[PDB]
Design a protein around this nucleic acid. Structure first.
Length: 132
RNA sequence: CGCCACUUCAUGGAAAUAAAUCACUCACGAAUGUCUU
């Protein structure tokens, strides 16, 4: 009976529980302009041997792509009635590392080798998962 | 030469002062760094 499942969504539920904000990962090109100048014979990238035009990139605010300041991969985004709201992944997900062992019950087992660390994630109080 | 006793019974000063006030050592050691379905 299952026919169609939507991609899992990150939904924010506010105190005024009448509207929900859907959060998406920030596009990797956000805040930057990519042109691909086509004057030809200028410069061609070879991605593992395939022809491709050169990706001229500028911030949408010139200078070039400074990968020392590139941080779009750390941000999640949602629609606002203005610009795009950027939320850090830190502010959404809380992470803790848990140490675990199996208590050595003697008269048996070669299991001193039971020793591990696990990562557990907690969602912020206003954030839930959803899909259709 | 004889005769004969009274008076006085602790005041002042010092009443604690300096030195050391914790020292050295150990401040985590060994096992497990994944295992069984």
């Amino acid at each position: 009976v299952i026919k169609q499942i939507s991609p899992l969504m990150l939904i924010e539920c506010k105190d005024d529980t009448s509207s929900r904000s859907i959060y998406f990962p920030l596009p990797l090109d956000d805040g930057y302009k990519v042109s691909f100048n086509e004057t030809s014979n200028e410069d061609k990238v070879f991605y593992n041997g395939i022809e491709c035009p050169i990706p001229n990139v500028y911030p949408a605010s010139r200078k070039f792509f400074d990968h020392k300041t590139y941080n779009n991969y750390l941000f999640w985004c949602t629609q606002g009635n203005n610009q795009i709201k950027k939320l850090l992944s830190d502010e959404i997900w809380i992470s803790k590392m848990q140490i675990g062992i199996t208590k050595h019950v003697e008269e048996g087992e070669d299991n001193d080798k039971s020793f591990y660390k696990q990562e557990f994630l907690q969602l912020k109080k206003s954030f839930i998962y959803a899909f259709y």
